[PDB]
Structure formats: structure tokens, C-alpha cells
Design a protein around this ligand. Structure first.
Ligand SMILES: Cc1cc(C#N)cc(C)c1Oc1nc(Nc2ccc(C#N)cc2)nc(N)c1Br
Lengths: 401, 551
């Protein structure tokens, strides 16, 4: 075809991002893959006159697949993939009974890439012990990972799906990066049969989460207040802190009564008996906390942020919000920390996409370097969200279950 | 010669035109030398004469020995495209495989041997001025990589890599390491079968415009390379001499820490901490620093380690790496990495405080993480560790700590001092233990503070502090509960900050206070520590808050 011209356009210059170290086996996989890609005309060796660089890694079940971190490039191309060739996101999508995620990235290998943009897709396979200088390539065709690729292709993506959509008008199909999200209120065998049908449309033309997703079964995790026969002073204090915190998100919470309960200067171990009203308040708060937050609404113009807390014993908790503590969804996830953490990250990101058509920035409770070393080992998506490292303030841990 | 290899396109920076700098008038000596150097270069095709239509210029100078052309590409460099960094790192001897014979070839007039993009040559124009700038100068521009230009390093290396590409394919046995003008070649061929293969290369390089020195102007072991001393089946660091000095300047200590530090890649147990402490406080480079006893203590222990030489072994990609760590003092960790027991591939140290307070267990993990990345770089694989911490100490810490922490394949080795958490806080409040509601206020303006407590057994103390913050007070208030209290105590606070510190089980701090508090927590049999919101009228919070609110 003819190639859609692209631009960063102002005084954002392209990406100059260091290549994180890779294990021997990943490096090999990567040269094996990139020798083929060169063969097929998808990428070309480049010379030193290309100062740009984007990191690449390899990931896995039985075959290795190549993954490129276009996070910066995406950041610096924002105006083009968002405002100049946006893909609208359908609100309908979360409401569906079953959503199936399908990889379509192999499509982008058929469209070529604007010749004057190619320079920005530079990456480096590096070498063990820095012995050799490291093989430099760049993309000639639309790359998987860059949010520009589905921007371009949507014109094509639309023609391919036209009949399927015409014949299935209650099936909602959404494209995010390399994947297609396909939602129905069909019964599962039917939902599943329609997915095969959809695959075959694609097959002419060229083509943690278990199987499908179930967005209509996606209820938030309430902040939960222990029920208790018996109450100690400690227990009330824990309870007062835990509600006093909740007040600053949930409108309607009240603590007065329990503060009454804590009258003097007493021992923590000392038991203290539930009041008439004190009990009344408790259940009244319990009720508020079950229902989501009144007042909090998604602003598409602000970034989505995601916090995660290690709850111990294979459990994690999480919150998505735009302005701090004003939560838009809160949740939960259930063999080693980093693995578990990267699964949660993929889960939370997947939901985030279904709901808002955008990935959250993560606040990860882990040492940067641990994470950078280990994340690629279990990661299995084709996107990579943005992330920063953070120390979980120990109370927030406690206030979520 | 001038390689036939195709050129690399080059371009000025987007909003920029090439330089138009004025040629300062030169002396005749220099005029003469330049004319001389320039004709000869002209005659080998390195530069070509041009007219006065070419409107670009750079300055030329000559320094003495015998004469040398110095061009100043300050403007053209500031004005020329950026490029990719040459090498992303430097190989480590530990990562190298052993070799029977090695040969180090040097490429002659390297840059001048590689062509410059025709389109770019224009901008390299320079001018030999006439005596006292009466008449028009002689104008030349470059046909090859000029010396001092921003692009030369990179373009040379690519060129050389392209030129080697085939030869490597054709000779998978042999190995070549390209750095700058140098090539470093090695094989496990026997000296004559090797020497021949060198030749196929030298001719190979000539076939492409690159000349090298003749068949008996080339070194024999041990090779000196990037501060290392490389031998066929071993390596170590170029020789380290620690000066005997009755008086140490800042500079002297600076250079020593450098050498020791460099030394620590193979000599185990080098320590540099007490020497580095001397460097705190901005002092002149010539200022003499009195050695403390502990620095002196350290300097001799380093001398012992260094007295007899130590070497390291090369890597064998069939066997596993085993990495051992030892705690050699406060904040000081030392490691050695090997494949067969005690044939060390390399050695090293870690001594880094991340944040303000920390504990041995956290430190050990930081250390593991550092060595893990380091191994990916040098060997492409991570090791098996042999750590001085009980699996059960490690288990206890990770599960109950809120950060995700994960270390790969390891084992406990009993090489003391052992890593241990020195106190553990209780999980539930203690019956028959006194409860200290503690608090701290501080006037933000007088900076006086008040640190106090109230208890459920009636006690109340309220001390007065001077120049401190809110943070310090709520910490002084805890120190107090722990001093005045018994072997088991419950302590209630409104500071999340204080809780933070302490919940993390520190055993080391940058605060003197927190170190006092740690001492105390080590003495206790039991501690439980709880938090409540400030100013919410809580039983007991409210009472300390009153007592502590004057000022
Ligand atoms: C060949 C060579 C010589 C010198 C230099 N000088 C420096 C370097 C980086 C070299 O490259 C390599 N050397 C070795 N092992 C090795 C073994 C013994 C000796 C000796 N003596 C030198 C190198 N392995 C490699 N893969 C590479 Br690449």
C-alpha cells in the first residue's frame, strides 16, 4: 500500500532509551527471530547515524516471542495515535457477559511504515559481556507495540470486521494495541463459536486470565469491617482509623459514636462493650462501603493511576484512581512475589483497558531493580504499562482487608 | 589507504547550517608546517583543494618533537547530528573464555582510512592562512574521517564491524574484540596455525583499506588490557602499589580508594569505608588528612590482602556460577563468584545504604540483586547464591514484610556473621504490659518541642526539647516510652512516619535517635506498636496531646 505519513511534529525528539541486560537465551531467541524478520523485509540493519533506541526483550508457552518497549515512542507520538487517528472506546464493552482477547498484531507486519518515521523504531540486540557491538535494526513495517500501528490500520481493521459486525450487531469489538477485544452477552458455547467464526474472517486477510473475561461479574472489593462478638480497645482503634480513613473517600461515614467508646486512658487488651448507637453506626457504614463511591467519575483527560499492596500469603489488593484516594475501582488478586505481582499487573491492566480504553500508571511495591531483572520472565502481554516504584505506607495495607 | 566500504550519511542538526568560523592569522612556522602536512595528506587523498564558493570554514592550528595538525571542530560538532553510542560497555575478564594464543593488532591512521559522506565533506572545509592574512588562503576539505569530529568514533566502528562481518562468519573458531584503533584477537590454535589465521585477517583488512603492523611487530603474554593483566588461562589487575606516606592529602586518599576499589575485582575482602569517611567535608585536594585509628586499621588489612598476588579464572560456559556473600562489617558486604570451589572468576564488594534506615536482611537482598544484574551482564546468566542467612530467617522476613522481595536459587552457608533480624514486633497487643500513649509537638517557629506520654497505669512524663521538628518529637516520645518502660510494652502513636520506620525492623540508621530506639527494642522481650489518628479525641491520644501542647 501507500504509507500514512507520521509525525512527532513539535520539539519532542525521538527515543534514546538504554537497553536493559538480557540473559543468554533471550538474546539468542532474539537473533533467531530477527534474522527471519530481516529476511522477510520487516526490519533492516541500521548504521550509527541512528541515535534512537528503544529496548527489546523476549517472552514466552513453548515458542519465544519478541517484545519491544515503545513506551517512550508512544509517549512522544501521542498527538497522532490519540487526536489525529483515535480509536473510540466503547462504553458497552464492560457490560458484556463474556469478553475474549485475540492477538491480531501479525496484521501490522503487512502494512509498511512511513519511510521518514522508520528511524525512530531503532532497537539493539546486545551481547554477552559486551564482546561484540550489538546488532542494530529498525522497522520497515508497522511494529507491534507502538500505539501508532493500530491507529493506521484501523481503516483496514474496519473493512475486515464489516461483515461480522453487520451479521452480529450485538457483538462489540474493540481494538487495543495488538489485541482485539470481543464482547457478547451470548451463552458461552455460542460466544465461543462466534469467536472461531471471527477468527476465520481474519484468517482470510492474514491471521492469570484463563480463557475469556467476564466483565458483568466485576464487582469492587468493599472495605470490610470485621464482625465481632467481642471488642478490645485495640480493635476499636483499628476500627476508628480504618473508618476515619474511609471518610475521606466515602461521603456519609460517621465515627463519633465509637470515639465515645474510647473514653479515658486505657489498656489495649481491655475489652469494652458495644453501644446502641455504636453498633447502629457500624452497620450504617458497612452499608456505605459496599456500594461504590458517590462523587467519583472518570475524566478522560487525566491519567489513570493504580496502586497495589502485598497482603501476605499470595494475596494482593489494588486501587485505580485518578485523584488520590477517590477510587474508581478497587480489587483483589489471588508461587513467588514477582511472578504474582506481574500477574496482578497484567490483570489490572486488562480490566483497565476494557473499562476506559487506557492503561494505568502503576505504583509498584518492589525494588526497581528486582522488578527490572525479573519482570520479563513471567510477563505474557504485548503491551507494557507505565510504572514507578513506591514504598507501600503500612497503614493503607491494613485499611484494605 | 581509504577503504572502499560505502559511506555513512550524515547530516547537521535540523535547525542548523554548517559552521563559518574565522581563521585566526597564524605564525609562519605554523603556516609552513600546515602547508607541509596538508600537501602530503592531499597526495594520499585525505583532503582535496577547493574554491571560495564553498562558504564553510573551521580553524586549523599546529602544535609541536615534530609538527601536528590540530583542527577545532567545536562548532561543527555542536552543529552535527547526534549518533549512537559506540560501545554500551566493556567486557570483563571474568566473562572471557581462556585462549591458547592471542595477538593484538593496531590499525594505522584509522580515521584517515575511512571515507566521509560526500554530501558532508563540504562542511569540513578549513583554511591555511597566508603570511599576515594579506592574501587568500589555501582551502581544503576532508574526504575522510577527521580527527576530533563528533562522528569519527562511531562511523569508524561501524565500518570496521561491517568489514569484519564476513571474516568472523568464515572463522567461527577465532575471536576478535574491536576497541578503537585496536583489534584484539585470540584462538585456541597453536602458535603457527594461529599466526597464519592472523595473516588471513591482515590481508583481509588490507583488502578493505586498513593497514596494520608487520608479522613480527606484535606482543606476547602477559597482555595489559584496560587495567587488567591478562594471561592465557588466568587474569588479575595491573599491578597495584599502595604508597607509604607519612602525610595523606585528599588527592592521595582519593587515588587510593580508586586503586583499592579497582583492586576489589579480584582481591577478596578489600574494604574502603573508613578511608572514605575521611573524604566527607569539602577540603582542598592538597589538604592533609590525619588518619584515624580505624582508617589505619583498615589500610593495613588491605595491605595484607595485597602483599601476595591473587589471580582469577576465566569462564566456562558449561558449568554453573556460584556466588557467595559475606557480611564483613556494618553496611559492608563482600562476595566472590566462582564455578569450581575457590577458583574465583571475580570478587567484589557492596556497601550501600538505600534510604535512611535499613536492616541486614534488606541489605543482603540488595546485595543479591546487584550481583544478579552484574551476572546477567558478564555471563548472561544468574548464579546460585550461597548466603549467610537461615532459610527460616528469610522466610519470616519476606512473608511479613510489605515490599515484594524475591531472590533466586540459594542456600544457607554457615559463614558468620549470620544475617538475623534482631527484634520482632508483636502482632497482637500484650496483656499485663503497660500501654504508653505517646505524642510529640513542636512549634514550627520557636522550634522548641515537647515529647511525652501517658499510660493506662497512670504514669505521665513530658520532657522539653529544643531545636527539633514534629518528626523528631514523635520519635523522642517513643524513645521515652521504651526507656521508662518494662520488658513488655504496648505503645500507641499518631505518627504514621514513626510506625513506618519501626515497623520495618531497622537495625541500622542514619539518625542517632533511631539508633537509640533500636537499642531499646533489642533489650525488650515484647513490643507491640499501634497507630491512631491524631486529634480525633481518642481515649489517651487526647490526654497526651493536651500535656504536650504548650509551646
Ligand atoms: C582476544 C582478546 C585479547 C585481549 C587482550 N589483550 C582482550 C580481549 C577482550 C580479547 O577478547 C577476548 N578474549 C577472551 N579471552 C582471553 C583469554 C586469554 C587472554 C590472554 N592472555 C586474553 C583474552 N575471550 C573473548 N571472548 C574475547 Br572477545
Amino acid at each position: 500500500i501507500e504509507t500514512v505519513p507520521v509525525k512527532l511534529k513539535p520539539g519532542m525528539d525521538g527515543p534514546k532509551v538504554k537497553q536493559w541486560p538480557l540473559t543468554e537465551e533471550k538474546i539468542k531467541a532474539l537473533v533467531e527471530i530477527c534474522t527471519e524478520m530481516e529476511k522477510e523485509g520487516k526490519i533492516s540493519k541500521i548504521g550509527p547515524e541512528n541515535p534512537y533506541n528503544t529496548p527489546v526483550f523476549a517472552i514466552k508457552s513453548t515458542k519465544w516471542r519478541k517484545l519491544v518497549d515503545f513506551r517512550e515512542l508512544n509517549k512522544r507520538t501521542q498527538d497522532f495515535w490519540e487526536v489525529q487517528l483515535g480509536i473510540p472506546h466503547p462504553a458497552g464493552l464492560k457490560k458484556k457477559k463474556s469478553v475474549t482477547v485475540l492477538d491480531v498484531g501479525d496484521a501490522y507486519f503487512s502494512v509498511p511504515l512511513d519511510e521518514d518515521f522508520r528511524k525512530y523504531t531503532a532497537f539493539t540486540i546486545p551481547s554477552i559481556n559486551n564482546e561484540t557491538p550489538g546488532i542494530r535494526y529498525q522497522y520497515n513495517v508497522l511494529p507491534q507495540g507502538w500505539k501508532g500501528s493500530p491507529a493506521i490500520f484501523q481503516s483496514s481493521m474496519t473493512k475486515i470486521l464489516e461483515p461480522f459486525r453487520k451479521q452480529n450487531p450485538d457483538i462489540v469489538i474493540y481494538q487495543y494495541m495488538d489485541d482485539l477485544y470481543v464482547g457478547s452477552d451470548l451463552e458461552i458455547g455460542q460466544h465461543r463459536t462466534k469467536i472461531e467464526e471471527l477468527r476465520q474472517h481474519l484468517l482470510r486477510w492474514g491471521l492469570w486470565m484463563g480463557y475469556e473475561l467476564h466483565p458483568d461479574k466485576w464487582t469492587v472489593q468493599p472495605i470490610v469491617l470485621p464482625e465481632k462478638d467481642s471488642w478490645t480497645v485495640n480493635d476499636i482503634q483499628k476500627l476508628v482509623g480504618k473508618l476515619n480513613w474511609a471518610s475521606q473517600i466515602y461521603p456519609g461515614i460517621k465515627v463519633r459514636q465509637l470515639c465515645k467508646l474510647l473514653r479515658g486512658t486505657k489498656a489495649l487488651t481491655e475489652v469494652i462493650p458495644l453501644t446502641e448507637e455504636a453498633e447502629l453506626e457500624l452497620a450504617e457504614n458497612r452499608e456505605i462501603l459496599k456500594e461504590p463511591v458517590h462523587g467519583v467519575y472518570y475524566d478522560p483527560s487525566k491519567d489513570l493511576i493504580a496502586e497495589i499492596q502485598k497482603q501476605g500469603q499470595g494475596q494482593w489488593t489494588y486501587q485505580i484512581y485518578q485523584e488520590p484516594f477517590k477510587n474508581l475501582k478497587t480489587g483483589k488478586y489471588a508461587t513467588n512475589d514477582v511472578k504474582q505481582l506481574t500477574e496482578a499487573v497484567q490483570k489490572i491492566t486488562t480490566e483497565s483497558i476494557v473499562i476506559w480504553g487506557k492503561t494505568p500508571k502503576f505504583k509498584l511495591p518492589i525494588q526497581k531493580e528486582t522488578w527490572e531483572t525479573w519482570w520479563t520472565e513471567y510477563w505474557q502481554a504485548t503491551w507494557i504499562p507505565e510504572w514507578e516504584f513506591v514504598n507501600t505506607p503500612p497503614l493503607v495495607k491494613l485499611w484494605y482487608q | 589507504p581509504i577503504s572502499p566500504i560505502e559511506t555513512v550519511p550524515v547530516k547537521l542538526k535540523p535547525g542548523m547550517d554548517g559552521p563559518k568560523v574565522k581563521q585566526w592569522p597564524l605564525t609562519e612556522e605554523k603556516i609552513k608546517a600546515l602547508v607541509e602536512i596538508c600537501t602530503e595528506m592531499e597526495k594520499e587523498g585525505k583532503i582535496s583543494k577547493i574554491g571560495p564558493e564553498n562558504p564553510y570554514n573551521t580553524p586549523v592550528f599546529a602544535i609541536k618533537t615534530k609538527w601536528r595538525k590540530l583542527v577545532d571542530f567545536r562548532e561543527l560538532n555542536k552543529r552535527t547530528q547526534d549518533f549512537w553510542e559506540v560501545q554500551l560497555g566493556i567486557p570483563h575478564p571474568a566473562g572471557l573464555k581462556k585462549k591458547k594464543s592471542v595477538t593484538v593488532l593496531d590499525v594505522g591512521d584509522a580515521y584517515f582510512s575511512v571515507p566521509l559522506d560526500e554530501d558532508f565533506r563540504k562542511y569540513t572545509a578549513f583554511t591555511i592562512p597566508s603570511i599576515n592574512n594579506e592574501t587568500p588562503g589555501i582551502r581544503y576539505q576532508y574526504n575522510v574521517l577527521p580527527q576530533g569530529w563528533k562522528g569519527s568514533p562511531a562511523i569508524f566502528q561501524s565500518s570496521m564491524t561491517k568489514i569484519l562481518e564476513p571474516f568472523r562468519k568464515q572463522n567461527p573458531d577465532i575471536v576478535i574484540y574491536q576497541y578503537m584503533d585496536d583489534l584484539y584477537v585470540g584462538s585456541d590454535l597453536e602458535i603457527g596455525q594461529h599466526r597464519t589465521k592472523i595473516e588471513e585477517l591482515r590481508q583481509h583488512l588490507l583488502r578493505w583499506g586498513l593497514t596494520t603492523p608487520d608479522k613480527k611487530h606484535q606482543k606476547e603474554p602477559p597482555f595489559l588490557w584496560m587495567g587488567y593483566e591478562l594471561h592465557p588461562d588466568k587474569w588479575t589487575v595491573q599491578p597495584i602499589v599502595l604508597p607509604e606516606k607519612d602525610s595523606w592529602t585528599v588527592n592521595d586518599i582519593q587515588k587510593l580508594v580508586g586503586k583499592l576499589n579497582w583492586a576489589s575485582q579480584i582481591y577478596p575482602g578489600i574494604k574502603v569505608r573508613q578511608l572514605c569517611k575521611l573524604l566527607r567535608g569539602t577540603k582542598a585536594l592538597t589538604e592533609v588528612i590525619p588518619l584515624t585509628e580505624e582508617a589505619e586499621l583498615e589500610l593495613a588489612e588491605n595491605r595484607e590482602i595485597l602483599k601476595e598476588p591473587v589471580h582469577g579464572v576465566y569462564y566456562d560456559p558449561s558449568k554453573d556460577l556460584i556466588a557467595e556473600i559475606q557480611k564483613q562489617g556494618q553496611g559492608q558486604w563482600t562476595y566472590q563468584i566462582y564455578q569450581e570451589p575457590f577458583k574465583n572468576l571475580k570478587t567484589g564488594k557492596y556497601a550501600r545504604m538505600r534510604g535512611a534506615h535499613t536492616n541486614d536482611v534488606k541489605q543482603l537482598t540488595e546485595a543479591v540483586q546487584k550481583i544478579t544484574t552484574e551476572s546477567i551482564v558478564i555471563w548472561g546468566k544468574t548464579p546460585k547464591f550461597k548466603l549467610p542467612i537461615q532459610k527460616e530467617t528469610w522466610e519470616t522476613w519476606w512473608t511479613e514484610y510489605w515490599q515484594a522481595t524475591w531472590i533466586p536459587e540459594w542456600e544457607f552457608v554457615n559463614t558468620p556473621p549470620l544475617v538475623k533480624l534482631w527484634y520482632q514486633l508483636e502482632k497482637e497487643p500484650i496483656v499485663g504490659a503497660e500501654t504508653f500513649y505517646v505524642d510529640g509537638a513542636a512549634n514550627r517557629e520557636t522550634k522548641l518541642g515537647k515529647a511525652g506520654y501517658v499510660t493506662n497505669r497512670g504514669r505521665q512524663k513530658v520532657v522539653t526539647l529544643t531545636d527539633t521538628t514534629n518528626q523528631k518529637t514523635e520519635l523522642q516520645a517513643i524513645y521515652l516510652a521504651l526507656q521508662d518502660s518494662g520488658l513488655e510494652v504496648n505503645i500507641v502513636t499518631d505518627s504514621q512516619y514513626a510506625l513506618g520506620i519501626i515497623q520495618a525492623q531497622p537495625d541500622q540508621s542514619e539518625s542517632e535517635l533511631v539508633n537509640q530506639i533500636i537499642e531499646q527494642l533489642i533489650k525488650k522481650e515484647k513490643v507491640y506498636l499501634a497507630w491512631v489518628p491524631a486529634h480525633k479525641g481518642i481515649g489517651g491520644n487526647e490526654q497526651v496531646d493536651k500535656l504536650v501542647s504548650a509551646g
